[PDB]
Paper text:
The [name] protein of human (HIV) and simian (SIV) immunodeficiency viruses is an important replication and pathogenicity factor. Our study thus provides insights into the molecular basis for the versatility of [name] as an adapter protein for the internalization of surface molecules containing endocytic sorting motifs.
The complex between [name] [name] 66–235 (SIV-B) and the [name] domain of human [name] 80–140 (SH3E), engineered in the RT loop for improved [name] binding, yielded diffracting crystals. The model contains residues 103–233 of SIV [name] and residues 80–134 of the [name] domain, whereas no electron density was identified for the [name] peptide. The asymmetric unit consists of two [name]/[name] heterodimers that assemble at the [name]–[name] domain interface with the C-terminal flexible loop of [name] exposed in opposite directions. In this crystallographic assembly, the EEHYLM sorting motif of the C-terminal flexible loop interacts with the hydrophobic crevice formed by the two central helices α4 and α5 of [name] and the interconnecting loop. As observed for HIV-1 [name] and its myristoylated full length variant, [name] [name] eluted as monomer in size exclusion chromatography experiments or as heterodimer in complex with the [name] domain. Thus, the interaction of the ExxxLM sorting motif of one [name] molecule with the sorting motif recognition domain of another [name] molecule does not lead to multimerization in vitro.
Numbering used by the authors:
A (entry chain D): 80 to 94, 96 to 135
B (entry chain A): 103 to 182, 188 to 233
Write the structure that this text describes.
Amino acid sequence: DIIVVALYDYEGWWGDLSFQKGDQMVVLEESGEWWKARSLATRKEGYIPSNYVAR
Amino acid sequence: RPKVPLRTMSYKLAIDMSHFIKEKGGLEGIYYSARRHRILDIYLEKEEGIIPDWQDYTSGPGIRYPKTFGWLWKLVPVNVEDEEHYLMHPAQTSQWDDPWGEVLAWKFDPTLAYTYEAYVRYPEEF
């Protein structure tokens, strides 16, 4: 139940989770620097740049 | 906005990015060269965090198929310079970059999202 919040907008590619600054989402995997996440807004899953978010 | 962390090119990235490049009018019909291969590598590395290990093509004469499945940009020979000019001037055609001396051009082919032609045609090259 680690929850992160967007610090910048991210327009991603197929397989990424796109988000906007302030969006909060669950981290589903935190390995490496690209993470799996589910958006609290949409329940949509995808990969995100870890440097775009913070706990 | 910061740079995104580096990553390998998944086939989904390959398909999504190929269509995006296609739609924004890039690459189609442009002459292939080693320099331009590297320019492409560099652009996507420093713009999408793509490690430049995905852009490889099949060897023999004729059409060169991308060896990363999902990348939709193949190399098509064009029917059309001495070696000394090649050395001293930046001629931008694959005539001397290409081991088989063909002049290659980039062509968009979306069936490359459906058929892994490189793998099905040239398994030995993997």
